[PDB]
């Protein structure tokens, strides 16, 4: 529930990922939201990764 | 042809819906959509209209003093100062959900935001035995797109 | 072709009595070309002929609104007379009748509170008086702000909104500086319904 949503919220608002990326990671974390914590992450590098 | 419900995007343990009674691309599911397809503003026609989009201040008011001395009461919870008009109050006794509550319409304030009043009833016994009522939020402008505050009786 | 609308009278209007309700028929897109157009109306089919009607441009889709409003008696109002315009025209074949009438039935008065501000809420610039009426029948009400005998009017309020109990509840937010909560000594929330004495009841409030 709880954890689940702040990621939602912040995959949402990281501004490096593309369309797919986002569509993905929100896709591969409604699908089993055990590993919210580790899908975060994930997309946090992720996107650091991508940033000009 | 409608919106979904503003609940229902804002949380994405739910099902945003687009009825009617994407992006020039066709879908054979119907009977829902993605939750971030509206945000961005795809188009289906509909779309999510954004325009200024400013965060609400949640306080939660208590029955007033005359209406103590009554058989029932009246919590309320006023949102204030929000954008775009869509938003979602609901009710909550630390846990479990109370549902006797009724909520007026989104009105323009002065300064073109938005204020809503939710009134949750109950017998003035309930006021005084449950220990917390929490009013919660869920607008675009809040960080998680939820916030909850809390009132006790004291 | 042309279409009517029908509006009841201002509340205001009708609880009080130096005060004089009115009937109103709107006629919107009538034909720039056809602008005459004649209304005659009826308070309970007898016809009456103290309608005033004026004809108006719309400039904005550049069509006629013709508006007729019959000021009316408050007996004949609050009994639940059905008053009635026809409306007819070039471009009405045959012409087009609307009918409005109070709804005479269940009538409870309200209950009036004043909400001070949430305590959060005494840490702005701004603070937010609530007046909360609730339980009342049928759901036209007024509300108004005074701040002694000044009247305020940075006042905004809810639609009455049913209730669970078949009743309406109303919320009325008086914006105000946070100075003004701590200065002034004695703010009213005003409301008139028809089912209170003298069709007006006054809560008064302090710091
Ligand atoms: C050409 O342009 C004009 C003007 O354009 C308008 O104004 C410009 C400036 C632009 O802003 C533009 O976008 C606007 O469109 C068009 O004129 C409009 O035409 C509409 C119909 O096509 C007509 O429809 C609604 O009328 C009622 C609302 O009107 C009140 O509120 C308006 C909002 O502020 C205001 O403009 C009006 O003046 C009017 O105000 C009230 O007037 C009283 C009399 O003077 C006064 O006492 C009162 O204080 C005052 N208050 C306020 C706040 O203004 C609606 O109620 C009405 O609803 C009915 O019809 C629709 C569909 O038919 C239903 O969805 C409704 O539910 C309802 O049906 C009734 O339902 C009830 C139950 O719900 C039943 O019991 C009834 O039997 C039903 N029928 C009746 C007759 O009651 C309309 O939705 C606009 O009012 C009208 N405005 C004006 C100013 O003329 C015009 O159409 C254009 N032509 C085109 C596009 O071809």
């Known amino acids: 529930n709880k954890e689940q949503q702040n990621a939602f919220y912040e995959i ?13 990671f929100i896709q591969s974390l409604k699908d089993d939201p055990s590993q919210s914590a580790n899908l975060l992450a994930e997309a946090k590098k992720l996107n650091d990764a991508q940033a000009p | 042809i409608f919106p979904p419900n503003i609940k229902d995007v804002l949380m994405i343990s739910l099902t945003p819906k687009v009825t009617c009674v994407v992006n020039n691309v066709e879908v054979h599911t119907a009977q829902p959509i993605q939750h971030q397809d509206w945000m961005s503003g795809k188009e289906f026609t509909i779309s999510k209209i954004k325009g200024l989009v400013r965060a609400p201040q949640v306080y939660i008011l208590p029955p007033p003093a005359e209406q103590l001395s009554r058989k ?14 869509d938003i979602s109050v609901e009710w909550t006794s630390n846990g479990h959900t109370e549902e006797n509550y009724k909520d007026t319409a989104p009105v323009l304030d002065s300064d073109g935001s938005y204020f809503i009043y939710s009134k949750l009833n109950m017998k003035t016994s309930k006021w005084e035995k449950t220990d917390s009522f929490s009013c919660n939020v869920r607008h675009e402008g809040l960080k998680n797109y939820y916030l909850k505050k809390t009132i006790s009786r004291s």
């Open chain 1, 12 to 24: 949402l608002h990281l501004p490096n990922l593309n369309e797919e990326q986002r569509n993905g």
């Open chain 2, 72 to 85: 029932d009461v009246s919590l309320t919870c006023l949102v204030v100062g929000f954008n775009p008009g």
